[PDB]
RNA sequence: AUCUGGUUGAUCCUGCCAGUAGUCAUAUGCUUGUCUCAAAGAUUAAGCCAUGCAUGUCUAAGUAUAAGCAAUUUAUACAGUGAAACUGCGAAUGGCUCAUUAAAUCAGUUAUCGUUUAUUUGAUAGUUCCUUUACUACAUGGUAUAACUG
RNA sequence: UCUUUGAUGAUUCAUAAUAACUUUUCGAAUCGCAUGGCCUUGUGCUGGCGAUGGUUCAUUCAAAUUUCUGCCCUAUCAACUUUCGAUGGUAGGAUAGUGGCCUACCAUGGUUUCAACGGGUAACGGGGAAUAAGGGUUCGAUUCCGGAGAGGGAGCCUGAGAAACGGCUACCACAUCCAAGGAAGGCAGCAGGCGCGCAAAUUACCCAAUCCUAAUUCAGGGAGGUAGUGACAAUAAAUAACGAUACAGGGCCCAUUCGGGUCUUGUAAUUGGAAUGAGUACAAUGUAAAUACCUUAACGAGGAACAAUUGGAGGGCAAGUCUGGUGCCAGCAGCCGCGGUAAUUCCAGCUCCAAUAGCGUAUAUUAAAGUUGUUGCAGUUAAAAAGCUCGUAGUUGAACUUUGGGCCCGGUUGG
RNA sequence: AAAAAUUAGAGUGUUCAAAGCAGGCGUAUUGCUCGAAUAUAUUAGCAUGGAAUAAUAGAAUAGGACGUUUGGUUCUAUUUUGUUGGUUUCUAGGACCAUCGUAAUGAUUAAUAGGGACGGUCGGGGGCAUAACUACUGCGAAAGCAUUUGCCAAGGACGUUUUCAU
């Protein structure tokens, strides 16, 4: 008979309809749920407490809104209709930084709009562009009040269609805007947040994060006490083998874990709880790089060609006074040295490595470089960057000591000088983050630079700006490289944004295992909020094969052109570099090489061969290269 | 009330495969300015279902001491309005789907001298104290419970 | 010097009497309004309109059974039914009531080549729907009437009426809350779900209309109405119309020959002015309130931008002798086929053709099809007459039995 | 007598149309007024007209049909003997029972359908016993069928003023 359906049906789908259950139904509504809800107003004159009271009048209790009015920004409310509990938060618009993390704790973001204006670019539209570029879960756009447009009906219709504007180019994934003045539109905004949960972010999810409910200090010692933290664990958990960072306080060491309706402690398998770990000096102790410049006449290149020749409003003005001067050096003459020689040009700049080739030989990154500071010695370089990436993600679930959705009175070993600036949780959120094994140790890192939209003001490599990665607010001096496809990682050193191609930023900072996107902003009080949004990007890897370049190219005014000797004017008033740079072959900048043999005189006269035209339409050129290193970072607060 | 291309060097046939129009016949591709009229979870799974609604009802004329209101006044039984609750009636109509079912359903056609029927419309009831008026009310017999208080 | 008696085609029918019989049925211990007439004047006696209830006969809305004839493919289903009711007789039980409906004793019947009985159905039946010279072929889950069902089977309560599921109770399959003691559940009603697949709309406003229910004019109604989403289908029809010169030709004519008239175009980023709704929007009207359509202030074009699109250009089948690929970006277009450079088909530019809101492609079905043949095909050589004669059912079967003659009335037609 | 809707269709300026069932006229001053048709047995049942075509029954052993030929056997009592019940006399009124009378008493042809007899013949037809003639043509339902003699039965055609009515 025709039970063969119930064969083929109930034996095609039985496990494919099983892979997606408990992630959806761990939120059953008496004890096991906590839905985290954030509300962002998009104009400065809004009452989100009233928007809350437009979201709860349709909930069929009555005595929930009136007693919760005075000064509270965190709410925990149980919905006795769809049987779910919510965690309703609301930040403070006077600060900007608090807005940027109240999104990234949540999964549904209530986007309010305005029925009297449009959005503003630098503050509303940028904060929309802020959260989607750092990554966010799903959301709902909404309008609170539509009383202001005149009480005829058709005029209150089309003003919705105008407000669709920022969901045609921003998102082709959301077409409705719910009018909360309508009672029947204000209910399926309550249906969806009590009954769904979206694909959230990748990196914040897979590490564990708890929001605080009760924070109190207890005494263990006058050197260090303890803080009890009450909350519910989200993410994957918190175990006693690694560390925890909280912003504006930093990193602190736990002691014990207790789940209160499993008593755990911290073992002695801690990591190096310091900034500059002493486990880096017993890995590199070889004295085998001796590129020297103390008595070297010409850099030894005996493996690169010919025989050598031996002898027997007050903030902006200080920053742009030498900014646009480098257009002569970066853009119109990119390969150039500064020369108007009337001074003692016998010893003006000497220490160099002027080899001609770029991408076919060896260059020792590590040297005994006097430009290489004390970071270069006591640091660990675990140089395998693919298996160690995939090792750390596997071990974490195996050391599962805390499962998600638990009521914890979390204790932590904590000092005594930081018992003041933590406020009550009702006026400010308090969250923690699970820090992996050996992340806080500083090392070398590499970023990527996505240039900010309609902002072509470049920035040199000499500014310790704060770059947001993960949750960490760290000021850091960046240096910039290219991402050219070559099997040696010798790329071009640039100093600014390359306005055409996504640039690569080399840095020295603690490692980020989460592969979090990078955020380039400038803290300056020019804007009322202490942010100048200047860029964004992401982290890729930690590099060990970098060879940077420093250009200094001797070009000037040529006048004399013989087939073997070429004399160039305003060059040699003190001829020393012609006898100092024998094994650095000259070349015409039209792509034609040449040979330097001897100093034929004193004012530009040297032996110079030409491959093409012998005339003063192009200047013979040199090539110089050096190597220096970035500066480490610092955790920025305030 | 109509036919055209294809077997052979060339021709007449049997013969099928392309073509050609229609569909209140369903999907699908690219396009899309106006007026009138409008089908729409049937096919496959008569598979599973979060939340809210879809069945209640009073006149001058069955029962009011609301510790209801209105007070307003001819009214010492009550009389204005009128929650709750008992009693009466309805909930068997309507709406939705097409799984079963092949002399079954169902159609046009007969039969009840072979039966039940709220309602509606029209008729219809001096006889019934042991009595023809002898004890024992007909100017009128008896308990029990609801709402409500605690 | 003494009888009445209904109706039907038909009755032991209606209806009446006599003896009785019964856990003795019904025969107003209810309610609003009015307030009068009579008197020995006693709260004496009578007396109006109508609400609700009541037994039986008629009646209306019904219900339950029943008579005759009528269904798609299949013999690779020829014999089926009768212990355990199958066909009939007699007496009881049960029901609103007839009847093997059930129970006792007996008889041995009933269906079948004019297809019983069994198997398939991606089968609810009809009114009807598409195509059509005539005959026909293929559909009908779906606005009206009839039946069945409420996750799957069974059982009963209250009632005039239900084997009811927005009633209850059991087992079967499910699945919800839980202080673990227990307690609750049926979207094939309306909106809406996460499932499936080629495949199908809003958790909106109201009882104003249509009609139903209630103790009732007043309350109720996802029944039903109004909008949102809708290239499912069907009707009406914007995307330009008029001049001037100009230069051409044809053109009829003055033609002498010119130009004397009449024309027709052709074009001249040659030049002019008039018309108008798509759209916007004061008012009014619409409507239960609104939205839109009809009406109408002010606004609204050289339109080059307020800009039509799908498919083809050997043949069938309307449309090219056109230039470009080193075969950038070659099987190749339903079927004959075109490629081996430059192609009278691929890939692109230009110019033409067809429909104008494309019927462009896919899958079913109808005409074409006299290729299902009753109307109406095919016999030797093309697919196709059984090895041979007797013989079932089925179909088909010679001729013959009152014709002719005469008279006369009364129809509408050519007249 | 076969419901409405739909289909063919009459009337009717929704501004035309698909639709709808409306609408038209005066003084517009308290009004009169026409509509909402008709057709479509399309099996089976019901009422009715006609007697072609094609079936079916009737008298052959006459228990045949008509008769007021005559003898019977029965069964009913409506009526009158006011009336009532108790009797039978007729009388009508039902059937069946012999024989006595008159009608012209009562049987379709004999298929250039079929069967059955009958008379003279013909044939390598078949069974038992004891080549040449073979094509030009012989016989048998077919496959098939050749030396003479005799038995046993069968069969076509012809001939006929026989018979039965497939």
Curated annotation (Swiss-Prot):
Q: Name one GO molecular function term.
A: ribonucleoprotein complex binding
Q: Where in the cell is the protein located?
A: Cytoplasm; Nucleus, Nucleolus
GO cellular component terms, A-Z: 90S preribosome; cytoplasm; nucleolus; nucleus; preribosome, small subunit precursor
The highest taxon in the source lineage is Eukaryota
Instruction: Tell me the keywords, alphabetical order.
Output: Cytoplasm, Nucleus, Ribosome biogenesis
Q: Which residues cross the membrane?
A: none
Which processes are annotated in GO (biological process)?
A: endonucleolytic cleavage of tricistronic rRNA transcript (SSU-rRNA, 5.8S rRNA, LSU-rRNA); endonucleolytic cleavage to generate mature 3'-end of SSU-rRNA from (SSU-rRNA, 5.8S rRNA, LSU-rRNA); maturation of SSU-rRNA from tricistronic rRNA transcript (SSU-rRNA, 5.8S rRNA, LSU-rRNA)
Q: Which InterPro entries match?
A: AARP2CN (IPR012948), Bms1/Tsr1 (IPR039761), BMS1_TSR1_C (IPR007034), G_Bms1/Tsr1_dom (IPR030387)
Residue span(s) of domain Bms1-type G: 33-199
Q: Where does it mainly reside?
A: cytoplasm
SMART domains on file: AARP2CN, DUF663
According to the record, the signal peptide region is none
What does the record's miscellaneous section state?
Present with 1390 molecules/cell in log phase SD medium.
> What is the role of the protein in this entry?
Required for 40S ribosomal subunit synthesis. Required for normal export of the pre-40S particles from the nucleus to the cytoplasm. Its subcellular location and association with pre-40S subunitshifts from mixed cytoplasm/nucleus to all nuclear in RPS19 disruptions, suggesting it acts after the ribosomal protein.
Task: Spell out the subunit comment.
Answer: Interacts with RIO2.
Question: What's this protein's family per the entry?
Answer: Belongs to the TRAFAC class translation factor GTPase superfamily. Bms1-like GTPase family. TSR1 subfamily.
Q: Which PANTHER family match?
A: PRE-RRNA-PROCESSING PROTEIN TSR1 HOMOLOG, RIBOSOME BIOGENESIS PROTEIN
Stated name of the protein? Ribosome biogenesis protein TSR1
Gene source species: Saccharomyces cerevisiae (strain ATCC 204508 / S288c) (Baker's yeast)
Q: What is the lineage of its organism?
A: Eukaryota, Fungi, Dikarya, Ascomycota, Saccharomycotina
This protein's gene is called TSR1
């Amino acid at each position: 008979s025709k039970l063969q359906r119930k064969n083929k049906a109930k034996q095609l789908r039985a496990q494919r309809i099983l892979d997606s259950i408990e992630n959806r139904k761990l939120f059953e509504g008496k004890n096991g749920a906590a839905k985290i809800i954030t509300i962002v107003p998009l104009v400065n004159d809004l009452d989100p407490l009233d928007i809350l009271y437009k979201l709860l009048k349709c909930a069929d209790d009555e005595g929930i809104m009136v007693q919760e009015v005075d000064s509270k920004r965190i709410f925990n409310v149980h919905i006795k209709k769809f049987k779910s509990n919510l965690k309703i938060i609301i930040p403070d618009m006077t600060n900007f930084l608090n807005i940027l993390d109240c999104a990234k704790v949540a999964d549904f973001v209530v986007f309010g709009l305005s029925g009297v204006q449009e959005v503003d670019e630098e503050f509303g539209e940028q904060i929309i562009r802020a959260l989607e570029l750092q990554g966010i879960a799903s959301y709902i756009g909404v309008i609170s009040n539509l009383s202001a447009v005149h009480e005829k009906e058709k005029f209150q219709l089309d003003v919705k269609q105008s407000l669709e504007s920022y969901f045609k180019h921003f998102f082709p994934s959301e077409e409705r805007v719910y009018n909360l003045e309508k009672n029947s539109d204000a209910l399926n905004v309550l249906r969806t947040l009590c009954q769904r949960l979206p694909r959230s972010i990748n990196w914040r999810d897979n590490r564990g994060y708890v929001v605080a409910d009760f924070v109190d200090f207890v005494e263990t010692s006058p050197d260090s006490g303890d803080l009890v933290i009450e909350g519910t664990v989200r993410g994957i958990g918190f175990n006693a083998n690694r560390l925890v960072h909280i912003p504006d306080f930093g990193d602190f060491q736990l002691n014990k874990i207790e789940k209160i309706s499993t008593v755990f402690e911290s073992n002695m398998n801690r990591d190096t709880l310091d900034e500059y770990a002493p486990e880096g000096t017993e890995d590199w102790s070889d004295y085998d790089e001796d590129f020297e410049y103390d008595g070297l006449t010409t850099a030894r290149y005996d493996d690169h060609g010919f025989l050598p020749g031996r002898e027997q409003p007050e903030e902006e003005e200080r920053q742009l006074r030498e900014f646009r001067d480098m257009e002569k050096e970066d853009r119109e003459f990119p390969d150039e040295i500064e020369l108007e020689p009337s001074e003692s040009a016998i010893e003006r700049l000497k220490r160099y490595r002027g080899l001609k080739n770029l991408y076919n030989c060896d260059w020792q990154v590590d040297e005994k470089d006097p430009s290489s500071p004390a970071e270069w010695k006591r640091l660990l370089r675990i140089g395998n960057y693919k298996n160690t990436k995939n090792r750390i993600i596997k071990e974490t679930k195996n050391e599962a000591q805390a499962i998600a959705g638990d009521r914890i009175r979390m204790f932590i070993r904590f000092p005594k000088f930081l018992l003041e600036k933590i406020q009550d949780p009702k006026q400010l959120l308090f969250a923690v983050y699970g820090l992996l094994l050996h992340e806080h140790k500083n090392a070398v890192v590499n970023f990527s630079l996505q240039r900010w939209e309609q902002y072509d003001k470049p920035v040199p490599s000499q500014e310790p700006i704060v770059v947001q990665y993960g949750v960490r607010r760290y000021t850091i001096q960046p240096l910039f490289s290219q991402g050219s496809n070559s099997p040696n990682n010798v790329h071009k050193y640039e100093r600014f944004l390359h306005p055409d191609t996504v640039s690569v930023a080399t840095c020295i900072a603690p490692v980020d295992f989460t592969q979090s996107p990078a955020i380039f902003f400038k803290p300056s009080p020019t804007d009322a909020k202490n942010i100048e949004l200047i860029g964004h990007g992401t982290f890729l890897n930690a590099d060990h094969s970098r060879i940077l370049a420093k250009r200094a190219i001797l070009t000037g005014h040529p006048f004399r052109f013989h087939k073997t000797v070429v004399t160039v004017r305003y060059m040699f008033f003190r001829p020393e570099d012609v006898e100092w740079f024998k094994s650095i072959p000259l070349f015409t900048k039209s792509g034609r090489s040449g040979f330097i043999k001897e100093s034929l005189g004193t004012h530009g006269y040297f032996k110079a061969t030409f491959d093409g035209k012998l005339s003063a339409q192009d200047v013979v050129a040199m090539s110089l290269y050096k190597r220096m290193w970035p500066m480490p970072s610092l955790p920025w607060n305030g």
